Amino acid sequence: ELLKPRTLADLIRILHELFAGDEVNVEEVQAVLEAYESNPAEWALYAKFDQYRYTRNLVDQGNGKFNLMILCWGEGHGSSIHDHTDSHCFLKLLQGNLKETLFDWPDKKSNEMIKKSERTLRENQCAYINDSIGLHRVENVSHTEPAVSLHLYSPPFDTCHAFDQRTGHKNKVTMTFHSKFGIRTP
Ligand SMILES: [Fe+3]
């Protein structure tokens, strides 16, 4: 029975119940993520920025079923065009705004990747993506406001592909955590 998360800690407890089985009810996970009202005091520990690019900060390992992490986006910071390695990916805004641009999977032929759509994700909104939906790029286009987002990936993954927008060619990238459980991990 899906109740409103009172705090980040309560949210994490609810997610462990939702991921207790072998499958994922996407709409229920999205609904509970959206229902958590961002409270900056609860996640300040994980919000560790870098001057030059966005940072990934591990919050919870989900008893092995999912990774929950906080991403911190300085002004102008963005991602590659990327896939999600056959995982579910949920993205909830905790602070600021992010622009999400969707792309189709490239064809074998080298060609410019054209965007299919774009939207602005605003505070407390939760977006969802998986490989069957397509690829995306996520960017903080603000010149004045850092953004902070809460990401849930199931199953967890530590590698994905980055796509060259000019050709559609991909390269495997291994992502690293900036911090884990509030502790910087160089
Ligand atoms: Fe993504």
PDB file of C-alpha atoms and ligand atoms in Angstrom:
ATOM      1  CA  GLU A   1       0.000   0.000   0.000  1.00  0.00           C
ATOM      2  CA  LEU A   2       1.623   3.178  -1.320  1.00  0.00           C
ATOM      3  CA  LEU A   3       1.869   5.931   1.319  1.00  0.00           C
ATOM      4  CA  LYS A   4       3.430   9.381   1.023  1.00  0.00           C
ATOM      5  CA  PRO A   5       7.135   9.337   2.004  1.00  0.00           C
ATOM      6  CA  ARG A   6       7.517  11.705   4.967  1.00  0.00           C
ATOM      7  CA  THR A   7      11.297  11.976   4.554  1.00  0.00           C
ATOM      8  CA  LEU A   8      14.141  10.706   2.361  1.00  0.00           C
ATOM      9  CA  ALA A   9      14.721   7.932   4.879  1.00  0.00           C
ATOM     10  CA  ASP A  10      11.048   6.935   4.665  1.00  0.00           C
ATOM     11  CA  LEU A  11      11.284   6.974   0.877  1.00  0.00           C
ATOM     12  CA  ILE A  12      14.247   4.612   0.964  1.00  0.00           C
ATOM     13  CA  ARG A  13      12.322   2.256   3.277  1.00  0.00           C
ATOM     14  CA  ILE A  14       9.365   2.282   0.869  1.00  0.00           C
ATOM     15  CA  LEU A  15      11.628   1.605  -2.137  1.00  0.00           C
ATOM     16  CA  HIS A  16      13.081  -1.445  -0.407  1.00  0.00           C
ATOM     17  CA  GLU A  17       9.543  -2.805  -0.125  1.00  0.00           C
ATOM     18  CA  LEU A  18       8.730  -2.014  -3.781  1.00  0.00           C
ATOM     19  CA  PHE A  19      11.895  -3.790  -4.968  1.00  0.00           C
ATOM     20  CA  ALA A  20      11.514  -6.801  -2.639  1.00  0.00           C
ATOM     21  CA  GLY A  21      10.399  -8.998  -5.581  1.00  0.00           C
ATOM     22  CA  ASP A  22      11.843  -9.830  -9.026  1.00  0.00           C
ATOM     23  CA  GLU A  23       9.859  -7.330 -11.091  1.00  0.00           C
ATOM     24  CA  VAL A  24       9.273  -3.573 -11.010  1.00  0.00           C
ATOM     25  CA  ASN A  25       5.934  -1.720 -10.991  1.00  0.00           C
ATOM     26  CA  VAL A  26       7.182   1.351 -12.774  1.00  0.00           C
ATOM     27  CA  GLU A  27       4.131   3.496 -12.281  1.00  0.00           C
ATOM     28  CA  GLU A  28       4.128   2.865  -8.507  1.00  0.00           C
ATOM     29  CA  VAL A  29       7.826   3.669  -8.189  1.00  0.00           C
ATOM     30  CA  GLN A  30       7.400   6.862 -10.175  1.00  0.00           C
ATOM     31  CA  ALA A  31       4.388   7.847  -8.039  1.00  0.00           C
ATOM     32  CA  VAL A  32       6.208   7.443  -4.720  1.00  0.00           C
ATOM     33  CA  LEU A  33       9.293   9.251  -5.992  1.00  0.00           C
ATOM     34  CA  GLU A  34       7.120  12.140  -7.160  1.00  0.00           C
ATOM     35  CA  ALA A  35       5.267  12.176  -3.819  1.00  0.00           C
ATOM     36  CA  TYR A  36       8.419  12.760  -1.772  1.00  0.00           C
ATOM     37  CA  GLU A  37       8.691  16.527  -1.237  1.00  0.00           C
ATOM     38  CA  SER A  38      12.347  17.502  -1.502  1.00  0.00           C
ATOM     39  CA  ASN A  39      13.739  18.665   1.815  1.00  0.00           C
ATOM     40  CA  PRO A  40      17.271  19.952   1.302  1.00  0.00           C
ATOM     41  CA  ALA A  41      18.357  19.296   4.929  1.00  0.00           C
ATOM     42  CA  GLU A  42      17.753  15.547   4.392  1.00  0.00           C
ATOM     43  CA  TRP A  43      20.054  15.270   1.395  1.00  0.00           C
ATOM     44  CA  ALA A  44      22.649  18.019   1.970  1.00  0.00           C
ATOM     45  CA  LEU A  45      25.148  15.296   2.963  1.00  0.00           C
ATOM     46  CA  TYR A  46      25.041  13.775  -0.550  1.00  0.00           C
ATOM     47  CA  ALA A  47      25.025  17.024  -2.517  1.00  0.00           C
ATOM     48  CA  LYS A  48      28.712  17.285  -3.282  1.00  0.00           C
ATOM     49  CA  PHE A  49      29.407  19.388  -6.367  1.00  0.00           C
ATOM     50  CA  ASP A  50      32.435  19.533  -8.670  1.00  0.00           C
ATOM     51  CA  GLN A  51      33.360  22.714 -10.528  1.00  0.00           C
ATOM     52  CA  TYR A  52      33.855  21.052 -13.921  1.00  0.00           C
ATOM     53  CA  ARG A  53      31.192  18.386 -14.311  1.00  0.00           C
ATOM     54  CA  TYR A  54      28.187  16.742 -12.679  1.00  0.00           C
ATOM     55  CA  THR A  55      28.837  14.323  -9.812  1.00  0.00           C
ATOM     56  CA  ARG A  56      27.228  11.003  -8.907  1.00  0.00           C
ATOM     57  CA  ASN A  57      26.742  10.425  -5.180  1.00  0.00           C
ATOM     58  CA  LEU A  58      25.592   7.017  -3.934  1.00  0.00           C
ATOM     59  CA  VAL A  59      22.825   7.153  -1.327  1.00  0.00           C
ATOM     60  CA  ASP A  60      21.611   3.540  -1.049  1.00  0.00           C
ATOM     61  CA  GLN A  61      22.511   0.197  -2.666  1.00  0.00           C
ATOM     62  CA  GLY A  62      19.049  -1.217  -2.348  1.00  0.00           C
ATOM     63  CA  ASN A  63      19.923  -4.662  -0.993  1.00  0.00           C
ATOM     64  CA  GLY A  64      21.285  -5.308  -4.516  1.00  0.00           C
ATOM     65  CA  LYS A  65      18.086  -4.601  -6.465  1.00  0.00           C
ATOM     66  CA  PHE A  66      18.753  -0.955  -7.283  1.00  0.00           C
ATOM     67  CA  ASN A  67      21.169   1.934  -6.922  1.00  0.00           C
ATOM     68  CA  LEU A  68      19.791   5.191  -5.494  1.00  0.00           C
ATOM     69  CA  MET A  69      22.038   8.191  -6.078  1.00  0.00           C
ATOM     70  CA  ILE A  70      22.092  11.963  -6.073  1.00  0.00           C
ATOM     71  CA  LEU A  71      23.504  13.850  -9.066  1.00  0.00           C
ATOM     72  CA  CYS A  72      24.735  17.436  -8.626  1.00  0.00           C
ATOM     73  CA  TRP A  73      24.822  19.621 -11.706  1.00  0.00           C
ATOM     74  CA  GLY A  74      26.681  22.875 -11.715  1.00  0.00           C
ATOM     75  CA  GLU A  75      25.587  25.667 -14.006  1.00  0.00           C
ATOM     76  CA  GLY A  76      25.913  24.569 -17.599  1.00  0.00           C
ATOM     77  CA  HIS A  77      26.767  20.962 -16.659  1.00  0.00           C
ATOM     78  CA  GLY A  78      25.307  18.184 -18.767  1.00  0.00           C
ATOM     79  CA  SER A  79      25.549  14.540 -19.711  1.00  0.00           C
ATOM     80  CA  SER A  80      26.385  12.650 -22.855  1.00  0.00           C
ATOM     81  CA  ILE A  81      23.661  11.186 -24.996  1.00  0.00           C
ATOM     82  CA  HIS A  82      23.407   7.830 -23.287  1.00  0.00           C
ATOM     83  CA  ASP A  83      21.519   4.565 -22.790  1.00  0.00           C
ATOM     84  CA  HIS A  84      20.726   2.749 -19.548  1.00  0.00           C
ATOM     85  CA  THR A  85      22.131  -0.759 -20.026  1.00  0.00           C
ATOM     86  CA  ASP A  86      18.805  -2.577 -19.996  1.00  0.00           C
ATOM     87  CA  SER A  87      17.790  -0.987 -16.684  1.00  0.00           C
ATOM     88  CA  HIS A  88      14.891   1.035 -15.442  1.00  0.00           C
ATOM     89  CA  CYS A  89      15.911   4.625 -14.755  1.00  0.00           C
ATOM     90  CA  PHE A  90      13.986   7.105 -12.654  1.00  0.00           C
ATOM     91  CA  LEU A  91      15.020  10.746 -12.275  1.00  0.00           C
ATOM     92  CA  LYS A  92      13.464  13.106  -9.751  1.00  0.00           C
ATOM     93  CA  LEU A  93      14.393  16.762  -9.426  1.00  0.00           C
ATOM     94  CA  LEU A  94      15.319  17.831  -5.846  1.00  0.00           C
ATOM     95  CA  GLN A  95      16.591  21.339  -6.739  1.00  0.00           C
ATOM     96  CA  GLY A  96      16.533  23.455  -9.914  1.00  0.00           C
ATOM     97  CA  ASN A  97      15.632  22.394 -13.438  1.00  0.00           C
ATOM     98  CA  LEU A  98      17.032  20.013 -16.006  1.00  0.00           C
ATOM     99  CA  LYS A  99      16.471  19.838 -19.734  1.00  0.00           C
ATOM    100  CA  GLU A 100      15.932  16.279 -21.039  1.00  0.00           C
ATOM    101  CA  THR A 101      16.450  15.694 -24.784  1.00  0.00           C
ATOM    102  CA  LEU A 102      15.238  12.383 -26.288  1.00  0.00           C
ATOM    103  CA  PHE A 103      16.900  10.611 -29.189  1.00  0.00           C
ATOM    104  CA  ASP A 104      16.081   7.508 -31.193  1.00  0.00           C
ATOM    105  CA  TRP A 105      18.545   4.609 -31.283  1.00  0.00           C
ATOM    106  CA  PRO A 106      20.934   5.203 -34.229  1.00  0.00           C
ATOM    107  CA  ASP A 107      20.827   3.122 -37.416  1.00  0.00           C
ATOM    108  CA  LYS A 108      23.984   1.228 -38.448  1.00  0.00           C
ATOM    109  CA  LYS A 109      24.741   3.987 -40.958  1.00  0.00           C
ATOM    110  CA  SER A 110      26.773   6.978 -39.748  1.00  0.00           C
ATOM    111  CA  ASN A 111      24.330   9.879 -39.486  1.00  0.00           C
ATOM    112  CA  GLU A 112      23.587  12.886 -37.320  1.00  0.00           C
ATOM    113  CA  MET A 113      21.384  12.013 -34.352  1.00  0.00           C
ATOM    114  CA  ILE A 114      18.323  14.273 -34.475  1.00  0.00           C
ATOM    115  CA  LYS A 115      16.349  14.963 -31.347  1.00  0.00           C
ATOM    116  CA  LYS A 116      12.861  13.494 -31.168  1.00  0.00           C
ATOM    117  CA  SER A 117      11.700  15.771 -28.361  1.00  0.00           C
ATOM    118  CA  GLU A 118      12.772  17.805 -25.371  1.00  0.00           C
ATOM    119  CA  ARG A 119      11.260  18.816 -22.062  1.00  0.00           C
ATOM    120  CA  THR A 120      12.089  20.745 -18.949  1.00  0.00           C
ATOM    121  CA  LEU A 121      11.996  18.734 -15.737  1.00  0.00           C
ATOM    122  CA  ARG A 122      11.082  20.964 -12.781  1.00  0.00           C
ATOM    123  CA  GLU A 123      11.517  20.623  -9.010  1.00  0.00           C
ATOM    124  CA  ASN A 124       9.941  17.482  -7.508  1.00  0.00           C
ATOM    125  CA  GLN A 125       8.936  16.072 -10.947  1.00  0.00           C
ATOM    126  CA  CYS A 126       9.938  12.438 -11.665  1.00  0.00           C
ATOM    127  CA  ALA A 127      10.865  11.278 -15.156  1.00  0.00           C
ATOM    128  CA  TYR A 128      11.344   7.701 -16.331  1.00  0.00           C
ATOM    129  CA  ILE A 129      13.414   6.210 -19.142  1.00  0.00           C
ATOM    130  CA  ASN A 130      14.511   2.831 -20.413  1.00  0.00           C
ATOM    131  CA  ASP A 131      16.191   1.602 -23.571  1.00  0.00           C
ATOM    132  CA  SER A 132      12.862   0.793 -25.255  1.00  0.00           C
ATOM    133  CA  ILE A 133      11.831   4.436 -24.883  1.00  0.00           C
ATOM    134  CA  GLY A 134      15.105   5.660 -26.349  1.00  0.00           C
ATOM    135  CA  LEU A 135      18.290   7.514 -25.484  1.00  0.00           C
ATOM    136  CA  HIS A 136      18.611  10.841 -23.704  1.00  0.00           C
ATOM    137  CA  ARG A 137      20.835  13.714 -22.722  1.00  0.00           C
ATOM    138  CA  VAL A 138      20.220  15.537 -19.422  1.00  0.00           C
ATOM    139  CA  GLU A 139      21.534  19.090 -18.919  1.00  0.00           C
ATOM    140  CA  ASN A 140      21.460  21.928 -16.439  1.00  0.00           C
ATOM    141  CA  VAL A 141      21.149  24.865 -18.840  1.00  0.00           C
ATOM    142  CA  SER A 142      20.921  27.419 -16.051  1.00  0.00           C
ATOM    143  CA  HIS A 143      23.605  30.095 -15.788  1.00  0.00           C
ATOM    144  CA  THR A 144      22.737  30.892 -12.153  1.00  0.00           C
ATOM    145  CA  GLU A 145      21.158  27.829 -10.425  1.00  0.00           C
ATOM    146  CA  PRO A 146      22.794  24.514  -9.626  1.00  0.00           C
ATOM    147  CA  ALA A 147      20.485  21.483  -9.987  1.00  0.00           C
ATOM    148  CA  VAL A 148      20.221  18.371  -7.853  1.00  0.00           C
ATOM    149  CA  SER A 149      18.460  15.207  -8.903  1.00  0.00           C
ATOM    150  CA  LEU A 150      17.642  11.831  -7.347  1.00  0.00           C
ATOM    151  CA  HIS A 151      18.203   8.798  -9.625  1.00  0.00           C
ATOM    152  CA  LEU A 152      17.119   5.206  -9.201  1.00  0.00           C
ATOM    153  CA  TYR A 153      18.467   2.477 -11.496  1.00  0.00           C
ATOM    154  CA  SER A 154      17.273  -1.126 -11.418  1.00  0.00           C
ATOM    155  CA  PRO A 155      19.140  -3.422 -11.848  1.00  0.00           C
ATOM    156  CA  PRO A 156      22.159  -1.400 -10.829  1.00  0.00           C
ATOM    157  CA  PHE A 157      24.752  -0.795 -13.572  1.00  0.00           C
ATOM    158  CA  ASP A 158      28.201   0.839 -13.604  1.00  0.00           C
ATOM    159  CA  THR A 159      28.721   1.043 -17.393  1.00  0.00           C
ATOM    160  CA  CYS A 160      26.684   2.539 -20.244  1.00  0.00           C
ATOM    161  CA  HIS A 161      27.241   3.918 -23.739  1.00  0.00           C
ATOM    162  CA  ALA A 162      27.834   7.486 -24.779  1.00  0.00           C
ATOM    163  CA  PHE A 163      26.707   8.409 -28.322  1.00  0.00           C
ATOM    164  CA  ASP A 164      28.409  10.824 -30.701  1.00  0.00           C
ATOM    165  CA  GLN A 165      25.668  13.158 -31.864  1.00  0.00           C
ATOM    166  CA  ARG A 166      27.362  13.653 -35.246  1.00  0.00           C
ATOM    167  CA  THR A 167      27.524   9.941 -36.255  1.00  0.00           C
ATOM    168  CA  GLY A 168      25.534   7.836 -33.812  1.00  0.00           C
ATOM    169  CA  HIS A 169      28.706   5.926 -32.940  1.00  0.00           C
ATOM    170  CA  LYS A 170      28.885   4.691 -29.357  1.00  0.00           C
ATOM    171  CA  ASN A 171      31.613   4.192 -26.779  1.00  0.00           C
ATOM    172  CA  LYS A 172      31.398   2.259 -23.539  1.00  0.00           C
ATOM    173  CA  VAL A 173      31.829   4.434 -20.458  1.00  0.00           C
ATOM    174  CA  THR A 174      32.343   3.296 -16.868  1.00  0.00           C
ATOM    175  CA  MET A 175      30.847   5.683 -14.359  1.00  0.00           C
ATOM    176  CA  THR A 176      32.413   6.299 -11.009  1.00  0.00           C
ATOM    177  CA  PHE A 177      30.955   7.551  -7.766  1.00  0.00           C
ATOM    178  CA  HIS A 178      32.089  10.914  -6.460  1.00  0.00           C
ATOM    179  CA  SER A 179      30.931   9.792  -3.019  1.00  0.00           C
ATOM    180  CA  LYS A 180      29.229   6.863  -1.288  1.00  0.00           C
ATOM    181  CA  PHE A 181      27.047   7.241   1.781  1.00  0.00           C
ATOM    182  CA  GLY A 182      28.216  10.840   2.233  1.00  0.00           C
ATOM    183  CA  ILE A 183      31.907   9.916   2.026  1.00  0.00           C
ATOM    184  CA  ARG A 184      34.107  11.242  -0.786  1.00  0.00           C
ATOM    185  CA  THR A 185      35.568   8.320  -2.779  1.00  0.00           C
ATOM    186  CA  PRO A 186      38.454   9.496  -5.001  1.00  0.00           C
TER     187      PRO A 186
HETATM  188 FE    FE B   1      20.118   8.826 -18.134  1.00  0.00          FE
END
